[PDB]
Structure formats: C-alpha cells, structure tokens
Amino acid sequence: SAKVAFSAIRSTNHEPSEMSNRTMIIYFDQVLVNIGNNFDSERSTFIAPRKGIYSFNFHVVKVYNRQTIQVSLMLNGWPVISAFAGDQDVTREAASNGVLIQMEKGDRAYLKLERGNLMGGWKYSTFSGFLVFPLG
Amino acid sequence: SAKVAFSAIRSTNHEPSEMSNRTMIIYFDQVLVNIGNNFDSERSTFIAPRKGIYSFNFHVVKVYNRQTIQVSLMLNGWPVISAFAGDQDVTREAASNGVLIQMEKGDRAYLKLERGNLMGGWKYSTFSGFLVFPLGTKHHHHHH
Amino acid sequence: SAKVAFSAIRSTNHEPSEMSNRTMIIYFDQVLVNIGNNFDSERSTFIAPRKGIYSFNFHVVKVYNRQTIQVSLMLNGWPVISAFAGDQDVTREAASNGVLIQMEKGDRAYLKLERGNLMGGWKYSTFSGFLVFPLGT
Numbered sequence A: 001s002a003k004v005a006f007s008a009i010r011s012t013n014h015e016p017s018e019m020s021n022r023t024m025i026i027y028f029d030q031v032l033v034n035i036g037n038n039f040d041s042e043r044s045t046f047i048a049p050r051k052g053i054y055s056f057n058f059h060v061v062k063v064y065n066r067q068t069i070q071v072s073l074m075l076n077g078w079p080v081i082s083a084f085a086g087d088q089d090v091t092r093e094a095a096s097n098g099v100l101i102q103m104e105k106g107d108r109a110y111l112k113l114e115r116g117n118l119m120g121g122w123k124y125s126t127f128s129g130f131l132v133f134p135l136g
Numbered sequence B: 001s002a003k004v005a006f007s008a009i010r011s012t013n014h015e016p017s018e019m020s021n022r023t024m025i026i027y028f029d030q031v032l033v034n035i036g037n038n039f040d041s042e043r044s045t046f047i048a049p050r051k052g053i054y055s056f057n058f059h060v061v062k063v064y065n066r067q068t069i070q071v072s073l074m075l076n077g078w079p080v081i082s083a084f085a086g087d088q089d090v091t092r093e094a095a096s097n098g099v100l101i102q103m104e105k106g107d108r109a110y111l112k113l114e115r116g117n118l119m120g121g122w123k124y125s126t127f128s129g130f131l132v133f134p135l136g137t138k139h140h141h142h143h144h
Numbered sequence C: 001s002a003k004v005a006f007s008a009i010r011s012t013n014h015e016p017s018e019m020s021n022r023t024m025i026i027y028f029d030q031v032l033v034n035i036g037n038n039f040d041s042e043r044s045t046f047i048a049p050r051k052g053i054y055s056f057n058f059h060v061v062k063v064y065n066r067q068t069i070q071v072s073l074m075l076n077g078w079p080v081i082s083a084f085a086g087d088q089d090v091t092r093e094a095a096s097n098g099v100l101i102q103m104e105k106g107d108r109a110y111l112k113l114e115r116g117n118l119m120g121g122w123k124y125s126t127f128s129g130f131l132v133f134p135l136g137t
C-alpha cells in the first residue's frame, strides 16, 4: 500500500487542554482524511507505516493573545522546520511552513508549540501530510 | 488515468469583474497546468474526474484596500478551510492555506472570498491542486 | 525512475555572501532530501531530470532589517510566482508561495530575491519540490 495520507483541522475556539500545557503538542480535533489510519487523532501524531519520502504542511492560526508563538514540525523529538506568528488585533495570522522529509517505519511526526501559548484557541489551523513515494 | 493536476495564477492588477462582486469567487486568468483538463479557467473551478484524495494549495495576494479578507477553499459551495490577511500598505499580504480532501466524481473545488474585497487586484495569487491517489468503491463517501 | 524530490533549509543566522549580493539568489545550506540528486546545493538550483509536472514550495523567513522583500521562483531566469514580506520587529514573517509547473529536462528552478535584502539572515527558510508525475512527448 503506497497510498498514505492524512488531514486534520482545528475547528473550534476551545482552549488548550491541561495535557497541551504539559506536552506542548498542538492537537487537531477534526480529521478530514486518514488513509491507512496512520494518524493518531488522540495524540495528533503521524506514525509512518513504511520507509519513504513524506510531505507535510501545517498552518497554525492564532488570535490576539498578547503573545507571539513559534511552531515546529517534529520528527522523533527533533525539530525539522519552524514557523512564527506575531501579535496584533487587526487580524488572525498563521505560522505556516512545509517540507519533504525521509521517514522510517515507526517515525513520529507532529507539531510542537516551541514558544508562546494558544489562548483564544487555534481555530482554522490545519495539519496534513502524505507519502510521496516509498523507499527500499 | 491517475494523472490529474492543475495550476493557475493571477497575473494582472485588473479589478474584480461585476460577476465577481456577485459570486464572490476568486478567478485566475492564467493556467500554467491543467492535465486532464479538469480545471475550468473561465469559472475557476476544479471538477474531480474520479474518486480519490486531492491536494489543494492557494495563496491569495492582496493590496491595501482598507478591508481585511478571508479566503476559503470551497467544496460544493461549502467551506473546508480558511485563510486570512490583514490590512497593510507597506506590503502585500497573503491568505494562504492548503489541505488534503477526499472528493467524489463531479465534486467542485474553488476559492470563494468569504469576507472583504479584492480591490486593487490580487496579482501574484496562486491556486493549484492535484490527485494524490485515486480510491475504489471499497472506500465510503466523504462527509461534507 | 519516477521518484524525484528535494528539500532544503536555511539553518543559520549567517549573513548573505558577497556572491549572494551579486546573483540575488537565495541559498540553502542544509539539504534534508535530494532523491535523484537533482538539486545542486552549491547553486541552490533544481535541474529537472525529465519532462513532467513538478511541485514547488518555498518559505523565506526574514527578520527586521529596515527592508521589505520580494522572493520569486525562477524558471530558466524567468519569474513564475512571487511572495512578499513586510517589515516589523514584533515577529519574523515569511514570503511564501507554491505552484505546479511543467518542466522539460535541463530546466532550472531556483529562488531569487527581487527586492530588498536578507540582512540578519534568513534562518528557518525552506525550499522543497518533487515530481508529481512525468510526461511523454
């Protein structure tokens, strides 16, 4: 099965759980796509089912919370890429980035809040990824 | 044919047509890619040729118009994801987002301006998408 | 081989080289992915190994440097798409865009800084792309 893809969104203003405060992981409640069921909605983590090149994209949308944030795409406790978002009232802004990375079976991909907080919720945030092609 | 992909850009300063004012749809005049010819440039809509997982990306670039905007990727006239863009003169701002969604044959994907306007044009804006992989009748239909 | 993909990032605060000032090309020092080895790290340019539809994405992250910038994706010395980024101190912001384009073998893809400068470095910047599917004559 070379068909692997997932897509998740934050669909509500709801505040960060105590677990979020603890783990600093950005959680996505609603999953539009999860072929291969390789994305664990509970931990909001993608576990690669096989060795290959995966694509990832994320947009973390925040509101005026008096805070500036930094989101990082994580690979097994290692940062791959980072995105930033300032603080102002006129609009929402997004910490967005994307990348191709090689993953091994059982490698974990997820988003971490490296800085700031997501008070006021992070509605409209998105996290998606898919296997571009596998490797031997 | 599992090869399906399209790419369109806004290449001019030109203002929104009177049609745009009514439909609130973001139109892209120049098409760089349209394999399968499933993207109709005139109405700027992607009609899925088959059931599968599709990727979509868009960057809507605006100029200072005293309004803040919200762009949404639409699936059969209902929003899937949204992007925002502030109001600023020193620079252009982009309402950007992207997502993977399941589509059925005849499902329509396009960008609609949920709020604000694009006076001053939306030059350099981009909208693209492609079939990641198809699906058979074993998979249930998507909820949207 | 229909497997072609590359991914590069700017991992340091380091300033633009004297070469960068001349060519206006945005350079990425660290390569996360380069299947087919079609991405030249030295010149930060992707040379298409075959005719097909390629996907490209880039995020150029700048800091407060008294300048506003414009980054463009170049195809054989011609701009395809562009991105912009204002100037303010409260945060970093990114000039981001992406597109699908048809390329033939030997076509060159790279990022050029059309305006402003990247003093203060462009750390956390990203540039990636891959062959979606090939095409025949």
Ligand SMILES: *[C@@H]1O[C@H](CO)[C@@H](O)[C@H](O)[C@H]1NC(C)=O
Binding pocket: A016, A017, A018, A019, A021, A117
């Ligand atoms: C999480 O931390 C914030 C402070 O950043 C606090 O206001 C909030 O009550 C905490 N939420 C939970 C569920 O612990």
Ligand SMILES: *[C@@H]1O[C@H](CO)[C@@H](O)[C@H](O)[C@H]1NC(C)=O
Binding pocket: B016, B017, B018, B021, B117
């Ligand atoms: C569209 O509406 C705006 C105000 O929302 C108006 O200024 C503009 O003139 C309208 N478009 C045209 C073509 O008249």
Ligand SMILES: *[C@@H]1O[C@H](CO)[C@@H](O)[C@H](O)[C@H]1NC(C)=O
Binding pocket: C016, C017, C018, C021, C117, C119
């Ligand atoms: C590159 O150019 C900028 C401004 O044009 C200048 O401040 C900087 O010193 C230059 N760097 C080198 C290495 O020439």
